[PDB]
Amino acid sequence: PQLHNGLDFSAKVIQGSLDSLPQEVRKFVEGNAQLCQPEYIHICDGSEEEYGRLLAHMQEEGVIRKLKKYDNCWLALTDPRDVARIESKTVIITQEQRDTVPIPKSGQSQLGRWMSEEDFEKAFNARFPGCMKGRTMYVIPFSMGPLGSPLAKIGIELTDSPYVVASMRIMTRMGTSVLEALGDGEFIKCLHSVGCPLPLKKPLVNNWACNPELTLIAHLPDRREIISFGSGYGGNSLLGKKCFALRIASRLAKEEGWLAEHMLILGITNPEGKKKYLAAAFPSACGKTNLAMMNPTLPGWKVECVGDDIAWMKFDAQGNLRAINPENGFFGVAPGTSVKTNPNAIKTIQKNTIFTNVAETSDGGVYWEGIDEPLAPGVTITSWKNKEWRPQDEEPCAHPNSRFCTPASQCPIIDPAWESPEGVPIEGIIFGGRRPAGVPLVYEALSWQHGVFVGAAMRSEATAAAEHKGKVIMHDPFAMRPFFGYNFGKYLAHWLSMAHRPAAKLPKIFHVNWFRKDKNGKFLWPGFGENSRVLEWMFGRIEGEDSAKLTPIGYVPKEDALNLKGLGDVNVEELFGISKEFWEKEVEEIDKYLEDQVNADLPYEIERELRALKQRISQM
Ligand SMILES: Nc1nc2c(ncn2[C@@H]2O[C@H](COP(=O)(O)OP(=O)(O)O)[C@@H](O)[C@H]2O)c(=O)[nH]1
Ligand SMILES: [Mn+2]
Ligand SMILES: [Mn+2]
Ligand SMILES: [Mn+2]
């Protein structure tokens, strides 16, 4: 016991019991309760009633609105400063700096931000003492991946924001059963605070609590802890998504020998009755969600969805590379999602969905740019800035990074094996980014080493996901630039090593580019549902059909290899053109980038592929 009673927080528990919590679980709660000083402690159980009283509270507090037009849908407008995933204030703390990033040969590193325990201890004590003063601390027990699944991991998130608690219920498997499964096992320690203790010294915008000045998202892989402060928007507050399942998981996978990757997983079936699973890694806002729920334009072809952001993969006993979706919902970009682009999306977000920073229509509906849908006469739109918006203004009605949060189970084309703990065998890996010119529509890798190189050499123009602005093409190897959990050189090594495992069935590797333009500035490829035609060519190359043409960068489709029926007017000349003048400069940037950023931790095989390609391009 104790001498007085300053350490027994039982009297503050409004739901739950610290006596029912596992040993090292209760210590984690009480320790931080002492440090953050919350007014109440709410031990979540994930029940439908709990989710009810949670929404009502947020509504009576002025945080979220009800979209009367649809079944149980809610809007939320955030502070205009807390609108995206802050990549500049995301740090990983390890003892030695090399464990996190390779030491640059010259300038600063682009593959992560490292911070010492000394620097972090000072910044921590300047943020968390008393940050939950007057708020409720929610104890979220959640599971990444199916319960009882092998590659499944359990985490405890503490937060003072009911906006996180509700999202986590959509995005993860959160409740009481997750507590009884953990028992005395190991768990990830997640801590989150909006940084607005009461009384409010800073007036809030749109009733959105957040402290932008002090925002910090820190990772301590050595301690299995994630500590986020100030922000409360998606990737910053859903600690089980980017912080856990990608950064922390990547280090665990390296240690244990599996893979945690920023990739979608889709299964595709052909008219003959054969079905194959593919995985695609694209940067943020570049095509993953639209592709994972694609409505294909080719007859007799079916595409089911397993996940659209994170994949955990590992070689099974038979040498098959199996993958699972550790997430439980979809956290996609709203703008551009219309009945014509992503029709499967429209069928899912119509219920139990939490929209954030999208526009509201006066009849209780949602509206965003590119929705391609006429509104009824007399229907008025309120933008995400909570202002009466007309199409005559320049301000877009919905924020570019505005999101929807819908459960995966509601998807009409949900794969009947996405909850399967055994996973799905992966027979192909797809890379690509937003390349406005130069890169052909699709090509195939020449070997496992070349393929790993293709992903190391990914580049794309700056989209609207982090804080990058302008039409600048930057490097994003494996679409994982903002999510590397350890040294990128050893990351590359970890991938090349999969070729050494016994009886391994390595998948093919492809690179696509939907975003090529002409001299005028027009997309040479329709895309979206028409991308099914490039999936048909990949399905055949996996079966081993001779429809490829060797080129200085990889196998490209033969003449008359693509099912282009229904178009014909498409310019194949410029869509597959491979200019020497372009690739001679591309390798020059890829060379300078790898020599400077990866420096001494660059495996030799990747440099061998760089040389091999540099040569084949000069021989033209
Ligand atoms: N031109 C073209 N644009 C696309 C295609 N797929 C998606 N987009 C655009 O890319 C944006 C983001 O797509 P999304 O799938 O949400 O990217 P994600 O961040 O990987 O999930 C959308 O607003 C679309 O307008 C495509 O095949 N072609
Ligand atoms: Mn997505
Ligand atoms: Mn993502
Ligand atoms: Mn090797």
PDB file of C-alpha atoms and ligand atoms in Angstrom, residues 85 241-242 246 262-263 282-285 288-289 308-310 327 331 403 465 479 483, ligand 3:
ATOM      1  CA  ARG A  85       0.638  14.218 -40.939  1.00  0.00           C
ATOM      2  CA  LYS A 241      -1.490   3.018 -37.826  1.00  0.00           C
ATOM      3  CA  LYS A 242       1.700   4.790 -38.909  1.00  0.00           C
ATOM      4  CA  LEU A 246       4.847   0.811 -39.952  1.00  0.00           C
ATOM      5  CA  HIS A 262       3.285   0.599 -46.848  1.00  0.00           C
ATOM      6  CA  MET A 263       1.412  -1.511 -49.380  1.00  0.00           C
ATOM      7  CA  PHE A 282       2.529   3.835 -53.686  1.00  0.00           C
ATOM      8  CA  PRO A 283       3.262   7.054 -51.759  1.00  0.00           C
ATOM      9  CA  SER A 284       0.408   8.862 -50.020  1.00  0.00           C
ATOM     10  CA  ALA A 285      -2.346  10.169 -52.316  1.00  0.00           C
ATOM     11  CA  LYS A 288      -3.542   2.801 -53.427  1.00  0.00           C
ATOM     12  CA  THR A 289      -7.136   3.128 -52.210  1.00  0.00           C
ATOM     13  CA  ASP A 308      -5.299  -0.338 -48.748  1.00  0.00           C
ATOM     14  CA  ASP A 309      -2.364   0.974 -46.686  1.00  0.00           C
ATOM     15  CA  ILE A 310      -0.436  -1.427 -44.447  1.00  0.00           C
ATOM     16  CA  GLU A 327      -6.035  -2.671 -39.948  1.00  0.00           C
ATOM     17  CA  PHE A 331      -8.730   6.011 -43.837  1.00  0.00           C
ATOM     18  CA  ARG A 403     -10.545  11.989 -44.977  1.00  0.00           C
ATOM     19  CA  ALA A 465      -0.191  14.280 -47.511  1.00  0.00           C
ATOM     20  CA  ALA A 479       6.761   4.552 -50.469  1.00  0.00           C
ATOM     21  CA  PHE A 483       7.883   5.510 -42.051  1.00  0.00           C
TER      22      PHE A 483
HETATM   23 MN    MN B   3      -0.689   5.547 -46.174  1.00  0.00          MN
END
